[PDB]
């Protein structure tokens, strides 16, 4: 069964470096070429890179020559891509593919992707507001704000995982300044708001926050 | 060099069929692939060396190759067919492949208003100087809308930020928009409107300070 796995996605400012990897299994590796094909937010898919089974031909978009460079390592079944000077338009979903002939071909297993986001944002843990329950049938939302933060992820769960039932915790937006804001609303019955306490858990792994926020 | 073109999208009621076109030079002498890349997923190839079907993929979908375009035809549009497709070539001559632009096929499904929920800035953000107001939407079906804001009866634009629409665990749609104010703004008001366009009609919320 053929098998790719990418690894080394990751957050960066312009101009660093970052390099994914491309582990394959299910086949004789040096029987085989290996693209890179990205997706930047929203669009279409780009064509990056290949390296010849053999490793004797390497290839690159105009967008990326002089940039990028590519490996391969047989004795691991492993790709390397080396991105230097990285630019925010080379943000994008980077995808691995197996191609099926020795070049002219077309990509016939591809991996499950890299996340690649180069901005000149820097780490930020959020602001956490509550968004009180005010004045639909006998059930109240209720909710928090979680504020300008940067990069993703951020994970919520409200008290401490014990309530599931009625959340919605929405995809965050990407601001003009760069940041990201999400929010998480849960519906419960008007009837609790006196007697129950509603806290929601913020986590941002990247910036080491977590936040615990009563809501009312 | 070479460009591929293929219409931009596509829309098809299911049982029909879907017909996506892929133009280029002496496509006669060249083979065309074609792959699929379905909302959050990797691409998979769905025909191969014009008229190829891979293992794994539906007999409904059949590449031809013929009279000088590439045809991706899907026969029996199920909802699941609902994807971004890519034609793909590489001229002998070229050293690097060269992908369409991709056709987006929408498949024609129970539609839904959006629900709206719209909450005021906070106390503690009001008095951190800043003033957010949050409009969830929520249970709407197919996945478009639009977004305004009114502050009184007057639009606007400036300081909102709204999501893309993206698919809930029950396959409908939902998205947010955030409207940033002054905390002078907030108060000088009578009060503040999200409304949510969805297919023609209207779902608004209104706040007050």
Redesign the interface.
């Given at each position: 069964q053929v098998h790719l796995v990418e690894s080394g996605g990751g957050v960066v400012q312009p101009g660093k470096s970052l390099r994914l990897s491309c582990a394959a299994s299910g086949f004789i590796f040096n029987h085989f070429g290996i693209?890179w094909?990205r997706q930047s937010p929203?669009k279409?898919?780009?064509?990056v890179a290949?390296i010849w089974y053999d490793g004797s031909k390497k290839?690159f978009?105009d967008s990326v020559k002089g940039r990028f460079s590519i490996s391969r390592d047989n004795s691991q079944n492993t790709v390397y891509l080396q991105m230097n000077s990285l630019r925010t338009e080379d943000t994008a979903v980077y995808?691995c593919?197996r191609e099926?002939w020795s070049?002219?071909?077309?990509?016939?297993?591809?991996?499950?992707?890299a996340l690649v986001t180069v901005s000149s944002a820097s780490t930020k843990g959020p602001?956490v507001?509550?968004?009180?329950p005010?004045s639909s049938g006998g059930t109240a939302?209720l909710?928090c704000?979680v504020?300008d933060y940067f990069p993703e992820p951020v994970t919520v769960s409200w008290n401490s995982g014990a309530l599931t039932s009625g959340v919605?915790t929405?995809?965050?937006?990407?601001?003009?300044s760069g940041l990201y804001?999400?929010?998480s609303?849960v519906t419960v019955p008007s009837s609790s708001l006196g007697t129950q306490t509603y806290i929601c858990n913020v986590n941002h792994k990247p910036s080491n926050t977590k936040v615990d926020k009563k809501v009312e | 060099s070479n460009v591929l073109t293929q219409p931009p999208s596509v829309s098809v009621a299911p049982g029909q069929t879907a017909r996506i076109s892929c133009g280029g030079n002496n496509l006669e002498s060249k083979?065309v692939?074609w792959?699929q890349?379905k909302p959050g997923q990797?691409?998979?190839?769905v025909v191969?060396?014009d008229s190829g079907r891979?293992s794994g993929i539906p007999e409904r979908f059949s590449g031809s190759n013929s009279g000088g375009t590439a045809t991706l035809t899907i026969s029996r549009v199920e909802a699941g067919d609902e994807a971004?497709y890519?034609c793909?070539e590489?001229?002998?001559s070229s050293?690097?492949?060269?992908?369409g632009?991709?056709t987006k096929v929408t498949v024609l499904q129970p539609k839904a208003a959006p629900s709206v929920?719209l909450?005021?800035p906070?106390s503690?953000?009001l008095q951190?100087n800043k003033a957010?107001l949050?409009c969830?939407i929520?249970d709407f079906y197919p996945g478009a809308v639009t977004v305004a804001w009114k502050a009184d009866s007057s639009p606007v634009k400036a300081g909102v930020?709204?999501?893309?629409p993206?698919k809930?665990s029950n396959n409908k749609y939902?998205?947010?928009?955030?409207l940033s104010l002054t905390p002078e703004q907030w108060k000088s008001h009578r009060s503040y409107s999200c409304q949510v366009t969805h297919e023609g009609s209207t779902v608004e919320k209104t706040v007050a300070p």
């Amino acid at each position: 069964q053929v098998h790719l796995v990418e690894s080394g996605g990751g957050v960066v400012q312009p101009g660093k470096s970052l390099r994914l990897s491309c582990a394959a299994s299910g086949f004789i590796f040096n029987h085989f070429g290996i693209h890179w094909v990205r997706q930047s937010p929203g669009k279409g898919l780009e064509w990056v890179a290949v390296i010849w089974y053999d490793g004797s031909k390497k290839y690159f978009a105009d967008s990326v020559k002089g940039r990028f460079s590519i490996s391969r390592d047989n004795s691991q079944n492993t790709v390397y891509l080396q991105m230097n000077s990285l630019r925010t338009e080379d943000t994008a979903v980077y995808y691995c593919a197996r191609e099926r002939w020795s070049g002219h071909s077309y990509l016939d297993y591809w991996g499950h992707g890299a996340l690649v986001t180069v901005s000149s944002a820097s780490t930020k843990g959020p602001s956490v507001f509550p968004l009180a329950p005010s004045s639909s049938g006998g059930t109240a939302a209720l909710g928090c704000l979680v504020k300008d933060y940067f990069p993703e992820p951020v994970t919520v769960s409200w008290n401490s995982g014990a309530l599931t039932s009625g959340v919605h915790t929405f995809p965050a937006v990407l601001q003009s300044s760069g940041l990201y804001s999400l929010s998480s609303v849960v519906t419960v019955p008007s009837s609790s708001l006196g007697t129950q306490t509603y806290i929601c858990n913020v986590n941002h792994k990247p910036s080491n926050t977590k936040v615990d926020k009563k809501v009312e | 060099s070479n460009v591929l073109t293929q219409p931009p999208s596509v829309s098809v009621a299911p049982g029909q069929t879907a017909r996506i076109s892929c133009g280029g030079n002496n496509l006669e002498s060249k083979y065309v692939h074609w792959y699929q890349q379905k909302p959050g997923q990797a691409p998979v190839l769905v025909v191969y060396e014009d008229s190829g079907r891979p293992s794994g993929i539906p007999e409904r979908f059949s590449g031809s190759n013929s009279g000088g375009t590439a045809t991706l035809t899907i026969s029996r549009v199920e909802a699941g067919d609902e994807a971004d497709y890519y034609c793909q070539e590489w001229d002998t001559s070229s050293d690097y492949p060269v992908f369409g632009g991709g056709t987006k096929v929408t498949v024609l499904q129970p539609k839904a208003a959006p629900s709206v929920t719209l909450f005021p800035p906070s106390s503690e953000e009001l008095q951190a100087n800043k003033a957010t107001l949050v409009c969830l939407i929520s249970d709407f079906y197919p996945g478009a809308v639009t977004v305004a804001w009114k502050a009184d009866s007057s639009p606007v634009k400036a300081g909102v930020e709204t999501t893309t629409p993206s698919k809930q665990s029950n396959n409908k749609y939902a998205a947010s928009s955030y409207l940033s104010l002054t905390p002078e703004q907030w108060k000088s008001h009578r009060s503040y409107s999200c409304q949510v366009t969805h297919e023609g009609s209207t779902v608004e919320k209104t706040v007050a300070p």
